[PDB]
């Protein structure tokens, strides 16, 4: 079906402790495959999946060099952004960058992304046309005019429509049995009393990939829903709960939608 | 594979 490749970069300043922290992670869909950490021993882009390890030394030297170049840009950006907002040297600040590309069922380019944040807020982002910038405040409009002048959008659009899609297709063919799988959720319901007059019905989804999933209740209000969470073995988990008057649990149903399921499931508990 | 051409803010 539809696929994607994303890179996530986190850059954090450390006042009076020298070098800033730089962390970079690469995903294909919901599977992490590479990482870099400035605090790690290696100072190399490291593998985080079996299928990526078959890439030769040339790939690893290239990505390492590229990620070290990202960190240098980011190191400067922290100082530049400090100037724009007129902030002190003694405070820690965070920069984040996400970029990547989507592909459809036919593995052709669908969409591309390049977003940039400062202290957890939108700073500047590339629009869906890939020729144009949304600036979030006056400081980012300075960056907008600078990036328009240096033809940044054009250079990004070349990467996003070309290199990004070619390497995504390559990774999808190398890690075929990992990335092109679809594990359906294994589901069950638990019941617990909370009162003489009330009772909790919890609905579980376990061992599913990818993470996109919908759990909803139906009757024929007080609904709890946890954030989808990693099992730690590649698959994901989620539960949804409702507090229901006891003696009326039979009229409530849990509904599960997921691409691994050929049709969506309906779960019912009865006393 | 990562981006190559990066421009400062």
């Amino acid at each position, epitope marked *: 079906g539809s696929h994607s490749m994303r890179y996530f970069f986190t850059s954090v300043s450390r006042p009076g402790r020298g070098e800033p922290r730089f962390i970079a992670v690469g995903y294909v869909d919901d599977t992490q495959f590479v990482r870099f950490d400035s605090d790690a021993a290696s100072q190399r882009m490291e593998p985080r999946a079996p299928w990526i390890e078959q890439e030769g030394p040339e790939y690893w030297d290239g990505e390492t*060099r590229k990620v*070290k*170049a990202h*960190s*240098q*840009t980011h*190191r400067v950006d922290l100082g530049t952004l400090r100037g724009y907002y007129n902030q002190s040297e003694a405070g820690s600040h965070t920069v984040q960058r996400m970029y990547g590309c989507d592909v459809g069922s036919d593995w052709r380019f669908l969409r591309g992304y390049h977003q940039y944040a400062y202290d957890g807020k939108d700073y500047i982002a590339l629009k869906e046309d890939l020729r144009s910038w949304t600036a979030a405040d006056m400081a980012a409009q300075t960056t907008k005019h600078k990036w328009e002048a240096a*033809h940044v959008a054009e250079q990004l659009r070349a990467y996003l429509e070309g290199t990004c899609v070619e390497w995504l297709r390559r990774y999808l063919e190398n890690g075929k049995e990992t990335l092109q799988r679809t594990d359906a959720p294994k589901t069950h319901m638990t019941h617990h009393a909370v009162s003489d007059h009330e009772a909790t019905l919890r609905c579980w989804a376990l061992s599913f990939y990818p993470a996109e999933i919908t759990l909803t209740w139906q009757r024929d209000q007080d609904t709890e829903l946890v954030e989808t969470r990693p099992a730690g073995d590649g698959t994901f988990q989620k539960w949804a709960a409702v507090v229901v008057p006891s003696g009326q649990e039979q009229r409530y149903t849990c509904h599960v939608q997921h691409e691994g399921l050929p049709k969506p499931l309906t779960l019912r508990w009865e006393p | 594979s990562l981006l*190559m051409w990066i421009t400062q803010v």
Partner: T-cell receptor
Amino acid sequence: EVEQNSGPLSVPEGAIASLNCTYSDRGSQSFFWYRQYSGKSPELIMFIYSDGDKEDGRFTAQLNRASQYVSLLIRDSQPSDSATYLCAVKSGGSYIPTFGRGTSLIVHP
Amino acid sequence: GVTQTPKFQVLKTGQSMTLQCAQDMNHEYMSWYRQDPGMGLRLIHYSVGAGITDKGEVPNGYNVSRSTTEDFPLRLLSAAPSQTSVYFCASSYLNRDSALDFGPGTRLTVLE
């Protein structure tokens, strides 16, 4: 990779100086002209990335991707344009620009 | 701009020396070229940022380090007569269209 005739090239004051530079890699993205006076450092004149002409005062960079060359034309050449002109090319698979050996230009007054 | 010291230097064969190169423009990329009469600019070492250095066309006999954004010193370990040359430091941003900015240069003569 990036080829340039060494010269010297002689041009009379007032005439057009025509400097050429070929390249082998079609994946080349941006193209640069630096000027180096004798005993001084190379200094940028201009860059070009899109096919066609680009004018900047008396200088005109010309890029032709089909025939794989970059040119620098200098209209109304003066004796102070006498220098070595260095061509450099940046490409897709590296951060290192590839330099030609440079062409020496003398403009006789 | 890009500064480098010293501008001229005489060494005897076997001596060590460090050519300084500093830039105040927050360039990520920094390089060291040598220029000799017949052979144009040849790359010695480069660095795309702090904590990484890489070999160029003619790295042998030279060392570099990049522990900061600004500085990119070139060490000559054991000076040889064939290292007699003009040495240029060159730095730039990482845009496609970023051009090198060259330092004033360092004329080195190594004698027996």
